[PDB]
Amino acid sequence: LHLIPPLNFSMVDNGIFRSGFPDSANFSFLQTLGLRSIIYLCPEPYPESNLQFLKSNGIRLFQFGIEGNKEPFVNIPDHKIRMALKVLLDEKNHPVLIHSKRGKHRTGCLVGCLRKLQKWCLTSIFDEYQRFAAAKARVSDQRFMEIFDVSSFS
């Protein structure tokens, strides 16, 4: 036994994964996925360790830096989520890992908006969001998904 998936790692769909921030202990696991792409949702620069892993493995980094904010005073990062969705929906970028810091809020919102495009009823989207967010589930994240207009992606 030796592979360590990154924090809160899960398969979302064919060619799509979610997690928190990978560190060097996770690189041997991430190698088994044959990633083409990472969608990174934090504003902080990528560490040198991570950049060397991407360069060694031919993985493209897409960064859409969403500022972390806590309830009750939240950002509505609509443009950044939609830019990340545009990349996520292009199969040429697959396999793709979506990650933020812990993979609960920013990652959860992007995945929830994907589920809405996949025609999941809201309660099913929120159940999946809650499974990762656990005691840190935010009503604001779920309201963002409730309000999200799918029009431009149909």
Ligand X SMILES: O=P(O)(O)O[C@H]1[C@@H](OP(=O)(O)O)[C@@H](OP(=O)(O)O)[C@H](OP(=O)(O)OP(=O)(O)O)[C@@H](OP(=O)(O)O)[C@@H]1OP(=O)(O)O
Ligand Y SMILES: O=P(O)(O)O[C@H]1[C@H](OP(=O)(O)O)[C@@H](OP(=O)(O)O)[C@H](OP(=O)(O)O)[C@@H](OP(=O)(O)O)[C@H]1OP(=O)(O)O
Q: Which residues bind ligand Y (CB under 6 A)?
A: 66-67, 75-77, 79-80
CA distances from 153 to 105, 120, 126, 146 (A): 22, 15, 20, 16
CB-based closest residue to ligand X: 68
| Contacting residue, 36, 86, 94, 101, with ligand X by CB under 6 A | 101
75: partner contacted, choices ligand Y, ligand X, none (Cβ within 5-8 A by kind) = ligand Y
Using a 10 angstrom Cβ sphere, with 0-12 exposed, 13-18 middle and 19 or more buried, the burial of residue 82 is middle
Q: Quote the least distance from Cβ 77 to ligand Y, whole Å.
A: 3
The CB-of-71 to ligand Y minimum distance in angstroms stands at: 14
Sole binder of ligand X in the list 104, 113, 129, 142 (CB under 6 A): 104
State in angstroms the smallest separation of the CB of 75 from ligand Y.
3
Least Cα distance to 69 among 106, 40, 19 occurs for: 106
**Strand locations in the chain, DSSP E?**
10-13, 16-19, 37-40, 60-63, 96-99
Distance of closest approach, residue 112 Cβ to ligand X, in angstroms: 12
